[PDB]
Design a protein around this ligand. Structure first.
Ligand SMILES: [Mg+2]
Ligand SMILES: [Mg+2]
Ligand SMILES: [Mg+2]
Ligand SMILES: [Mg+2]
Ligand SMILES: [Mg+2]
Ligand SMILES: [Mg+2]
Ligand SMILES: [Mg+2]
Ligand SMILES: [Mg+2]
Lengths: 506, 496, 506, 496
């Protein structure tokens, strides 16, 4: 704490708030988010596996990762489950998770959750040493510092929070559009903000509705700060027999409580502050919003609506203030900063992933050799172990003698060698000198394995492995090929989770 | 109405183990987590989180409160949780947050959960049917009596005070010896409640009633006395022990306030002087007042004396039953008898199955070469299983070992020894197939023949218990004696 | 605590629970109830005065009477406001006070309350020294120990609670019926339980519905304990063109959550545990319950309904267990015990009321004399005070001399004498000797009062007072006349607040 | 966005009085209740209940938490609430429940609310428009500086540390003397923050920056040192003072834990030895370790040293403004100037209206007989009012008294003295009509002529203030001086 802080105007307490309340730019999560999702991933609470009780996830989170009584654990679960909150839900919830009308979710003992399909994308390759881990509160568990997200989550799901008086307001966005942005950027590090907006014309809210005016959006994407207006989608309908005018509301601005908005209209009508309204009914159901606003016959529909736009939350403004943590500091960022931070994240992730796969590949190949060689010497080895008196003896005995690489010899004829393996081990001039750990591998293998279908199974795996090691080494060899792997991952994501824009921009 | 049964389940101690459901729920978690009395302390939040997720998914601070009370020497006569950190105190101040305190089981809690893994108690489903929970603990401790229970705070009837472990063990032995022993009989081992907080129980007829009917009222009295300062002649009342469940801070205030109101007179100063070491309430008598007089007023106007309504209502064969002292003892001895019985059946099954596997291993070993050659010949592991089972194997040097009470009862006669020909099971084929090369060193014959010889001796011993009600009672005696010895301690409460 | 408890099996803690969780038999309140209502009465939160914010009542309660953070304060307010909870609401609430569907009331800052009209009846004559007061937690305020209720509240509003394992379940009742019971009892102390049931045939729930079978009700009224079955009001309707069968539910048993009941039906239908149901809709609104249960065309309406009665809370039983605190102990009481306890309460109340009115009457009459006499001696008195140098002097001077009872003499020609007033004070043989406090009354009177319209105003009040004292003395004089005052008060209550029975008994 | 302004209002101190809204809300209630520093303590629940009902109807424990923090000597540099009972302590343990603690205003809180009833500050409506609340307090204390403020915990920017009252008063006087005084100028009166918890601020450039720009960072350092036991030679680190807002219990644990991890070495024992009397953390140095070395490690790995980010953001003319030390002083002096001005106008109106009534009384008195006879003649009190107003009254012996700056300004000229004829108002008729007989004793002339003579002297004095900017500044000086004298105290924090 003390050492590392000696050059901000920021003191320790100040930096805790920053770290807890502002999202990381690369995955758009704050620790509490990261901790819930991670706890879910550890439980195997997968999108395509049975729902677990929210309480079960709450207790894990609280026990291993977030030992405070704060409702934030459960509230975060609920929020990530609501389709009026996240443009791309990260939790798939079953039961009462509240509504657009502001009513509460059932208690954690009554709801069930699992990870949304897309959430796995956000935590893809978490086991491949792709991100740093930090200690939990008691030194007993590891927690991701950031998620290896294939999803440009901060943009797509947007953000809120405030620390040291510095607020963050990022609106949600359309995943397809954002992925296109990303690919555009990959092909042109110099692409202008204007060039990006060809792909990302503007925010895209889960609650649809309309944005009036692009000046707000441009300056937001250019500077990180800008105001934009969200307007309800509501026409006036006319009855062809009667001539009755009825305003219908299909969509409202993001973050507006539908019930509270209706209360407000009812109340303006009481106070004669808004005239011309015979009747007010919420006819919304499971299949879409429908607020019914019947116009008096002596009043004008167009006029009553316009009146409502100005006096209520049928129209609100939303101030974009794009702040995230970047390399540890809270910066204001423009649209291109945010995309670059993401693409750069993907490059780090993919590289570390590739390195890991390679080490895992080589370690397994190495082990395979020890066994292949063993299968090929069944009789000397078994007679060896059998006449040794102790496993420990069998081990130091195994290692004593190099071994005639038998029929196995062919299979070897050297990029499958562990970076850590010293030069006197391996296949030194016709013989095979064994790692002391490789002896274990042999001593550890079960009678079961001395079968016919062992040799097929192993030569096969080694074959597959070298093949893999080949392709991994070409990724590390070629920056082009590694950017290829990123484009394809992005493309794949566009295609499995991309959806139709919802908010219309005028 | 149903509301009733639920209110009742929540608050009522099971007579056998002394626990309410939330209690059993916390302690089981700690057990599952391996949070043992002799391993590193764990932060309370981890136990709380586990209990909330798997067993107790309600908002109520109940879970952490239970952990805390199990840790307070003023709460439980035999603490069930060993905790470091601030766990509040007698002045009714709060424990620290669960993220700061840390805990593990007390040695004695393991006695409460002894043999829990030997199928000795029934498990029920947890709230979402993904977990099991014991219905009662296989306790060696007569926990209800020794630790007590109360449901008064929540509107229920149960009010059982704590008791001295040695006294009660002895009680049980007296009972195991003379199942016809009277209440009076029992009362020579257990003259009365023993409170964690010492002090004095004043009078015996309440106790007698309570132990005879399950119902009676008793008086607890603070240990205090008058002191004269040798240099000045000033009198001071010093309070050393107060009645169970009285809040010191409160009591002091009741006095301060009684004094301010002229309701009690003769007091010139009021101070708490208690350490980590001793309670010490200092009440200075006025020079013109008399010590004894002030003190006797205090007894009768503050909680320096208090009544305790005994009402021994617990859960018995699924029901709230009012029970007397003999009933409660008997319910525990009966539980021990059952637990031990179940324990035994399980060790005997466990041992047999293992012996049966060990047999198959030895044989594979005395037929190493044939076997290896057989398995090598095969294409699928499948093939090698049916093959290893197709023929018998001559009981090599292995004959020595085996030659018949180590047959698991489920084994059908076409399997095992038949003519100096070992008839193999398919499961046993697996064990063989599953054998790691390392097990072919000369140190297998050894570890193996030694395990099997151990098995036979236990099996022998287990059959001896099942074959004698007496031997089984003797086991329960020994257990009870061992508890007395390892965990018994001094009476703390003086009965007049 | 210690002294007073030495003969129950009940210890101190035990007796606190009893005192807090079981209702007093005479007013049917527990302390928390009594404390909220009282706090409201003190605030003047009257039925016919503006709503105050619940929070305002909560803070009073919490500050003066009930200093615990428990939701019970606010929850009690809410419950006394809900028409599905109390047969006779004691709070008139405005805003979201929850519903039959179990959803929560808005926070205390959002709702408003005042006393219901009937609640004043419950606290009638609280200022007339009609009930004992106890100290609040800090010795700063007085709180009623019991309310001087004109309403037989325990019966009418019923009860719940549990202490030392002893539960209380009293159902609500119809006020008219209960008042008739009471009058029946007043006219015949020997009236049998059967005789009472002529008036009180059985419970009457705020949620209406039906009771099957009187054996339950009789034994409950005879012994205090008995079970009764409540059944929904639901017919099968048939469409005259189609022949479609549709079960409709208008009323459900008391204490059943409508939403949770519907969930249950939906769920039995899922599990094929109940067959024959095409559709399930709650069509309830502000104007009545309507659960729609459409029957499959190949199924029988009668059969589907009967099935639902047995598998759901469309039919429940309710175990009457009539326990209340009587003279401090928690007793099981029968129907006649409960009525007698009430009527006896009214007798105490009315007597103490009468005594009080009498003392207040006499004290005021006494004071009137001092002034009447003073008005009649304006000139000697004013010349007296004027030549005295100090108010204190004026006082001891006033008292020195008896005073020629002037024109005032007539007005006196003696049941208007304070019980506490010593024989040497008053109108001793032609002169008027003054109380030292009466001198104050004179010294205290304002120039304003020496007007013409003072003599009219005062002789008038005295006239009224003697008249009052007359009627009060006849009440204390005649046990018959005092029972009359009770009948009339009861009758009056029947007539202002009596309503139609709601539950039907079969 | 609006969410912003609200988050901001909730957390941001008004520069003039140093309070957040919830603060002003609690303190105003205590004031309304008359819960004064020299009256009986009141139970916290009564203040909490009042505040919740009239001013702060949210669930948040905020209300009781505020009361508590105002009572903690480790929290506020000048406590605003005097409380008895457990109000928690430096180890971050909790206060007792509001029903057990009791409180009243500290002497100094009255200075914060001085003249609150003299229309000296603006009131706004409370949440339901049935009550009024001051918008700011008419404080004589430069509270923001002296007591500090922080909104960091809730995501806001404000972080102002506390200061020494004497230092700041002096600062204000230096300012009142030379309105052009520099920051350097000011810093000779206020060299730095003064923490309730003493300890050491290590280095001056942070302070300088903070006071010049509103922004800068400072280091707080625990006061501790190495001791050698004369008999053994053993070294012990003794910790006496720790940085502001550090939790002792926490810090001790951080050390215990740092030790268990081999992260810091040289420690052989760790004990808290703090009384009611002194903080005393005992850290025993190993015989093979060096005191200084262990100690310097500790400084740099625990909260024995801590940074404090100063960020002087407060509310000024309705806005969050970053302000430097001169700005904050000036905003307070300006407030004093306004408050005093308003105070004066009000006393002058109050005094005049009262004088005007007193006049009418005197006259009624010198025309007692005529008047009495007039009122007696009447039928309705109404009649007697129009009658008493119909004619003038000769200014009897009363002439002496009156014979012209005691006319309330609102009085129109057809009323009062006109020719040796007193022209009565209708309001004045009421006062007369309202006179109690007891007021006709010879002790009326007295109490009356004395009050009026007092009125004139104050009126005289009040006009003297309005007529001289200088005199008014001198008043503000005197006030400030008086505060310095009654409430000033020693610097506690050492600055290096
Ligand atoms: Mg953490
Ligand atoms: Mg439940
Ligand atoms: Mg359960
Ligand atoms: Mg209590
Ligand atoms: Mg109370
Ligand atoms: Mg709000
Ligand atoms: Mg407000
Ligand atoms: Mg913290």
């Amino acid at each position: 704490i003390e050492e590392e802080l000696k050059s901000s105007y920021l003191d320790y307490a100040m930096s805790v708030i920053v770290g807890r309340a502002l999202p990381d730019v690369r995955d758009g999560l704050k620790p509490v988010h990261r901790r819930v999702l991670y706890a879910m991933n550890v439980l195997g609470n997968d999108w395509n596996k049975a729902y677990k009780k929210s309480a079960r996830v709450v207790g894990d989170v609280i026990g291993k990762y977030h030992p405070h009584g704060d409702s934030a654990v459960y509230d975060t679960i609920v929020r990530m489950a609501q389709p009026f909150s996240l443009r791309y839900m990260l939790v798939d919830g079953q039961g009462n998770f509240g509504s657009i009308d502001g009513d509460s979710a059932a208690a954690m003992r009554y709801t069930e959750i699992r990870l949304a399909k897309i959430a796995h994308e956000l935590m893809a390759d978490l086991e491949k040493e792709t991100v740093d881990f930090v200690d939990n509160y008691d030194g007993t568990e590891k927690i991701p510092d950031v998620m290896p997200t294939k999803i440009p989550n901060l943009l797509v799901n947007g953000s809120s929070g405030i620390a040291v008086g510095m607020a963050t307001n990022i609106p949600p966005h359309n995943l397809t559009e954002v992925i296109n942005g990303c690919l555009a950027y990959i092909d042109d590090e110099d692409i202008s903000i204007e060039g990006l907006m060809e792909h990302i014309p503007g925010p895209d809210f889960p609650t649809a509705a309309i944005i009036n005016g692009r000046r707000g959006i441009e300056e937001a994407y250019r500077t990180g700060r800008g105001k934009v207006y969200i307007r309800a989608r509501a026409e006036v309908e006319v009855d062809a027999k009667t001539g009755r005018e009825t305003i219908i509301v299909h969509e409202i601005p993001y973050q507006v409580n539908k019930a509270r908005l209706i209360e407000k209209i009812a109340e303006l009508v009481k106070e004669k502050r808004v005239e011309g309204i015979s009747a007010l009914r919420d006819e919304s159901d499971k299949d879409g919003m429908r607020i019914v606003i019947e116009v008096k016959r002596d009043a004008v529909g167009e006029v009553v609506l316009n009146n409502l736009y100005s006096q209520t939350q049928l129209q609100v403004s939303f101030g974009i203030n794009m702040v995230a943590l970047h390399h540890g500091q809270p910066k204001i960022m423009n649209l291109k900063d945010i995309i670059a931070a993401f693409v750069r994240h993907r490059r780090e992730v993919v590289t570390r992933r590739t390195i890991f796969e390679l080490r895992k590949a080589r370690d397994r190949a190495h082990i395979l050799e020890a066994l292949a060689v063993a299968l090929a010497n069944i009789d000397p080895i078994i007679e060896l172990i059998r006449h040794a008196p102790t496993p420990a003896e069998a081990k130091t005995a195994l290692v004593a003698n190099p071994w005639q690489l038998g029929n196995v010899a062919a299979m070897l004829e050297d990029a499958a060698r562990p970076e850590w393996l010293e030069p006197e081990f391996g296949v030194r001039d016709g013989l095979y000198y064994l790692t002391e750990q490789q002896a274990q591998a042999i001593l550890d293998l079960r009678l079961q394995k001395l079968t016919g279908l062992e040799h097929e199974k192993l030569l096969d795996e080694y074959k597959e492995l070298l093949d893999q090691i080949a392709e991994l080494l070409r990724i590390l060899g070629s920056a082009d090929r590694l950017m290829e792997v990123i484009r394809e991952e992005l493309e794949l994501v566009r295609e499995q989770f991309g959806d139709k824009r919802r908010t219309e921009i005028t």
